[PDB]
Amino acid sequence: LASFLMQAL
């Protein structure tokens, strides 16, 4: 999940 939110960056 973290990566799915951090993809914004």
Dist. CA 1–CA 9, nearest whole Å: 14
Experimental method: X-ray
Q: What 3-state DSSP class applies to 7?
A: coil
Residue type, 1: L
Both tokens of 6, joined, read 């951090």
Rounded to whole angstroms, how far apart are CA atoms 4 and 9? Answer: 10
User: By three-state DSSP, how is residue 5 classified?
Assistant: helix
Residues 6+ positions from 2 with CB-CB distance below 8 Å: none
Q: Which residues contact 1 (CB under 8 A, 6 or more apart)?
A: none
